């Protein structure tokens, strides 16, 4: 598979071993990591994590991206599709992090591109993910875009996002993905 994921102000490309330092730094930023998993601050350890990740990628099992801002081609975060299953065909996503240098609407664009990748580039039917209780704005984001709060445990709320909702969102959210082919005008 090869991806061509770009929106208005951001673009995504697959993680390489050389992104290890950017990743270590991002994930060990205490302003960003309140609700994600602890991980190594050691660059070589992170390079190793990516090498294993690359085997999974080679076998169609996982796709992990650096998020870039288009205007200066500088890295602003991460996102991942992982843990694929069947009946129905489902993917998880997460590892979703944006730093201070993010564009304003990067969160919207990157989420949309995830769903482009999963539902159209990879042919899944459903998306699953979770968000820690307390990560209030992220709950609100996902509910707004159309995720369905299935359920929960002591830590998380568990969501699914159906392919059907992604197809509505392509029209409603077209302004985030590219320049419009025609604009609405009221007389």
Ligand X SMILES: CC(C)(COP(=O)(O)OP(=O)(O)OC[C@H]1O[C@@H](n2cnc3c(N)ncnc32)[C@H](O)[C@@H]1OP(=O)(O)O)[C@@H](O)C(=O)NCCC(=O)NCCS
Query: Residues forming the annotated binding site for CoA?
Result: 96, 98, 102, 104, 135, 137, 173
d(CA 127, CA 85): 10
- Contact partner, 40, from Mg ion, ligand FUH, ligand X, none, Cβ < 5-8 Å per class: ligand FUH
Residue 4 or 29 having the CB closest to Mg ion: 4
* Binding characters for ligand FUH, 14-53, by CB under 6 A (x = yes): ---------x------------xx-xx-----x--x----
Q: Does 141 bind ligand X (CB under 6 A)?
A: yes
Residue 138 binds ligand X, judged by CB under 6 A: yes
Gaps in the chain after residue (C–N beyond 2.5 Å): none
Span interacting with ligand X, options 13-21, 55-63, 85-93, 97-105, rule CB under 6 A: 97-105
Cβ-based nearer residue to ligand X, 41 or 60 = 41
| Closest separation in Å from C-beta 121 to Mg ion | 11
Q: By CB under 6 A, tell whether 14 contacts ligand X.
A: no
Q: Does 98 bind ligand X (CB under 6 A)?
A: yes
Contact between 105 and ligand X by CB under 6 A: the answer reads: yes
Question: In this chain, which stretch among 1-9, 115-123, 126-134, 174-182 interacts with ligand FUH, using CB under 6 A?
Answer: 126-134
Tell me the closest approach of the beta carbon of residue 187 to ligand X, in angstroms. Answer: 26
Can you tell me the distance from the alpha carbon of 71 to that of 73, in angstroms, rounded to the nearest whole number?
6
Crossing angle of the two packed helices 136-145 and 106-115, in degrees rounded to 10: 50
Quickly list DSSP for 115-156: HIIIIIIS--SEEEEEEETT-HHHHHHHHHHT-EEEEE-SSE
Distance CA 134, CA 148 (A): 18
Cα–Cα distance between 155 and 131 in angstroms, integer?
A: 8
Instruction: Check: CB of residue 173 under 8 Å from CB of residue 7.
Output: no
With CB under 5 to 8 Å by kind, the binding choice for 187 among ligand FUH, ligand X, Mg ion, none is: none
Q: What is the dihedral of CA 146, 137, 79, 89, to 10 degrees?
A: -30
């Amino acid at each position: 598979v090869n991806f061509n994921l770009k929106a208005n102000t951001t673009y995504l490309r697959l993680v390489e071993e050389n992104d290890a330092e950017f990743i270590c730094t991002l994930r060990n930023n205490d302003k960003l990591n309140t609700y994600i998993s602890k991980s190594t601050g050691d660059i070589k350890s992170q390079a190793e994590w990516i090498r294993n990740y690359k085997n999974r990628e080679n076998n169609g099992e996982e796709y992990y991206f650096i998020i870039f801002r288009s205007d200066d081609q500088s890295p602003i975060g991460t996102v991942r599709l992982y843990d694929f299953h069947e009946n129905p065909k489902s993917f998880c996503w997460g590892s979703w992090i944006l730093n201070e240098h993010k564009t304003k609407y990067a969160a919207v664009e990157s989420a949309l591109l995830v769903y482009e990748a999963g539902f159209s580039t990879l042919g899944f039917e459903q998306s699953h993910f979770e968000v820690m209780k307390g990560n209030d704005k992220v709950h609100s984001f996902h509910l707004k875009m159309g995720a369905q709060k299935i359920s929960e445990d002591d830590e998380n709320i568990y969501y699914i996002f159906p392919k059907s909702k992604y197809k509505e969102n392509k029209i409603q959210y077209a302004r985030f993905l590219g320049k419009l082919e025609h604009h609405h005008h009221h007389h």
